[PDB]
Amino acid sequence: NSKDIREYLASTFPFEQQSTILDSQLKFRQENLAELKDQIILSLNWQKLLDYTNKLDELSNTKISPEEFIEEIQKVLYKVSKLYSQFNLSIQDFALQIIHSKYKSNQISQNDLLKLITEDEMLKILAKTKVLTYKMKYFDSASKMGINKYISTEMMDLDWQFSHYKTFNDALKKNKASDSSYLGWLTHGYSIKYGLSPNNERSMFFQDGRKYAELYAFSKSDLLAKINKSKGIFLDQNALLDKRIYAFHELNTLETHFPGITSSFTDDLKSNYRKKMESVSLTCQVLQEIGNIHRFIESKSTEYGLFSIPKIFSIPIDYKHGEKENLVSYVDFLYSTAHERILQDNSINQLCLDPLQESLNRIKSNIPV
């Protein structure tokens, strides 16, 4: 029974701002912008960054015409050292969070949102900003916990800091699902480009305009040869982990955004391909949720990346009564759900049971500490 954990997650920050596998903001954002503005002023090229921050502050609290908001946000998004690039990326993510809140606060209609987000230049910004912001905020955390190989482009928008991306993707899907599929294709290509999915060989499906065209042409019907080669590597129990996981992420994106492209009825029946794909996908989802718990425990400065939690809204240092117990119920229910649902076999354990066991060993040793 999970009534106590379900209630705790529905009331406690940041678990309240996201969903969980167990189920199956304006003032917060205004303060983050102020902290970013504070840093820009201290750093003062840099002058333009301060104009953008002031512009984002002006757009978020002053109520204008849906039409006026569209042209102003577009100008910032289209105009936009390591510190400079990080701040520039932070501005881009804030501009997208502001479009999201305008849509949620009914300041812009479904049509005004789509006028913005169905543009090719906006879709590339949605794809690139999500990938880079996730990398900036969680890549070092994921690397220390040894879960970085399991970062999945398809799971990113399930995280509490990436909620605005899910709203954009659902709006695109409902309007014209092929735009959401093109966005998915763009996003994974950027995961490959910016070191989230490392492979020695160039992608057979992403980061090439001609490859989106081949995928589109086939979906409106040697591409089968490329898919079979990727399926072969994923199913190969003797292939290097890095190769198998890269093949898993490419196939996962292919299946999520071009449903049916990776299916082969007779072959899949023999290899147990669907169940294996489902198990690895479940492993990535659980590992992301474990990472979020780890960063939370370590907060009791932010553990959630650059301009994530302002000082005023920081996670309380001590546990509220029953919190330690709720967190262990959450950790235990995640691994009990994972272990009941995953396929346990020598041909797949390397990608599911093994990483799950190692993460469980890591979190449970650090639990009393």
Side-chain angles (χ1 to χ4, degrees):
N1 206 72
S2 59
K3 172 213 176 57
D4 274 3
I5 187 58
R6 288 171 187 247
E7 278 206 84
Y8 164 87
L9 295 184
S11 62
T12 321
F13 172 86
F15 312 100
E16 54 161 32
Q17 268 145 80
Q18 67 166 39
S19 58
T20 180
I21 190 87
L22 303 185
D23 295 326
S24 71
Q25 266 179 289
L26 243 175
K27 290 175 187 279
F28 188 90
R29 167 177 311 125
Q30 280 178 316
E31 191 63 357
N32 269 144
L33 278 180
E35 285 189 10
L36 162 71
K37 195 194 166 167
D38 279 329
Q39 297 313 309
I40 297 156
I41 285 281
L42 283 172
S43 189
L44 273 162
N45 192 3
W46 282 88
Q47 292 172 217
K48 295 294 191 77
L49 283 189
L50 186 69
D51 288 343
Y52 300 138
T53 304
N54 284 146
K55 180 47 92 162
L56 284 197
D57 181 66
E58 169 207 335
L59 282 185
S60 78
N61 42 48
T62 90
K63 306 302 130 248
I64 53 172
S65 146
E67 295 288 84
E68 286 178 324
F69 172 76
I70 307 308
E71 172 186 56
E72 292 306 291
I73 199 70
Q74 220 162 42
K75 278 178 162 50
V76 177
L77 284 174
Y78 291 180
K79 265 291 296 299
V80 178
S81 66
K82 174 68 184 197
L83 193 70
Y84 183 89
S85 311
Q86 290 196 317
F87 285 9
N88 196 75
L89 179 70
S90 289
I91 299 305
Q92 270 191 104
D93 186 65
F94 281 127
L96 299 174
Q97 277 179 49
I98 289 154
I99 299 168
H100 178 251
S101 78
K102 286 290 182 184
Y103 178 60
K104 287 291 183 179
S105 81
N106 307 293
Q107 248 190 86
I108 58 153
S109 76
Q110 199 151 263
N111 289 136
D112 313 323
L113 174 62
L114 291 163
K115 271 188 176 198
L116 264 169
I117 70 172
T118 59
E119 287 296 317
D120 192 64
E121 200 181 354
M122 192 54 58
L123 294 166
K124 296 201 234 274
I125 292 171
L126 263 40
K128 197 176 165 167
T129 311
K130 182 169 98 177
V131 172
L132 288 178
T133 306
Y134 189 101
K135 201 193 171 200
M136 178 180 65
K137 299 197 164 177
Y138 304 142
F139 193 74
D140 293 333
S141 173
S143 303
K144 291 191 268 166
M145 304 175 284
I147 62 155
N148 58 96
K149 297 192 206 284
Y150 298 85
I151 292 169
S152 151
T153 309
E154 304 313 327
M155 301 305 154
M156 297 183 175
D157 72 12
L158 292 183
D159 182 84
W160 68 278
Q161 304 202 72
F162 291 84
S163 77
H164 54 297
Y165 296 106
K166 196 183 179 290
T167 309
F168 299 154
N169 192 46
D170 299 349
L172 293 167
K173 250 197 271 276
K174 192 177 191 163
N175 180 250
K176 187 200 263 186
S178 57
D179 291 341
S180 167
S181 167
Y182 173 69
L183 175 61
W185 179 86
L186 287 175
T187 310
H188 192 61
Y190 290 130
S191 279
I192 297 160
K193 191 179 184 201
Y194 294 115
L196 288 177
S197 197
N199 193 276
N200 180 260
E201 270 275 59
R202 273 285 181 204
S203 178
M204 290 173 299
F205 320 101
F206 309 93
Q207 286 207 268
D208 178 353
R210 292 164 302 175
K211 296 179 202 310
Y212 178 67
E214 287 173 67
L215 292 174
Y216 176 88
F218 178 124
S219 298
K220 294 327 267 272
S221 282
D222 191 48
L223 182 55
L224 218 125
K226 304 205 270 174
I227 284 155
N228 286 322
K229 193 204 186 278
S230 199
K231 278 175 72 171
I233 295 163
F234 169 70
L235 300 159
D236 188 6
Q237 99 156 90
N238 301 118
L240 295 179
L241 176 68
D242 281 0
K243 286 227 304 155
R244 303 192 62 195
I245 196 64
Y246 177 92
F248 164 76
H249 294 298
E250 278 205 333
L251 296 159
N252 194 37
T253 290
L254 285 188
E255 194 43 58
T256 300
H257 300 287
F258 307 90
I261 205 152
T262 66
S263 285
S264 183
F265 173 65
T266 323
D267 297 349
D268 296 352
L269 245 57
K270 296 218 100 178
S271 62
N272 210 20
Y273 173 70
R274 185 60 41 236
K275 293 255 178 283
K276 282 170 183 173
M277 283 302 287
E278 292 168 314
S279 303
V280 182
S281 183
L282 179 280
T283 293
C284 298
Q285 215 180 152
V286 173
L287 293 179
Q288 185 168 95
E289 277 195 49
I290 291 298
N292 182 49
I293 298 159
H294 190 254
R295 289 184 282 272
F296 186 72
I297 303 166
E298 285 194 330
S299 299
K300 295 191 179 280
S301 66
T302 180
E303 288 316 313
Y304 291 93
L306 199 73
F307 309 113
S308 57
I309 318 153
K311 308 275 157 182
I312 308 176
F313 300 117
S314 65
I315 297 162
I317 272 263
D318 64 283
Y319 298 74
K320 55 169 181 174
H321 155 294
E323 205 153 24
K324 286 196 205 53
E325 17 293 280
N326 278 152
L327 291 174
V328 190
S329 303
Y330 188 16
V331 171
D332 287 353
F333 282 146
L334 277 163
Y335 292 104
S336 76
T337 297
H339 200 268
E340 280 156 29
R341 297 218 216 140
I342 64 162
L343 168 73
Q344 254 186 240
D345 194 76
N346 292 131
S347 73
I348 201 61
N349 285 340
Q350 316 112 293
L351 295 195
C352 331
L353 187 66
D354 300 12
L356 276 165
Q357 179 81 260
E358 169 105 10
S359 78
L360 166 64
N361 291 354
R362 277 156 109 130
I363 196 141
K364 287 300 181 69
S365 66
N366 297 354
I367 286 299
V369 182

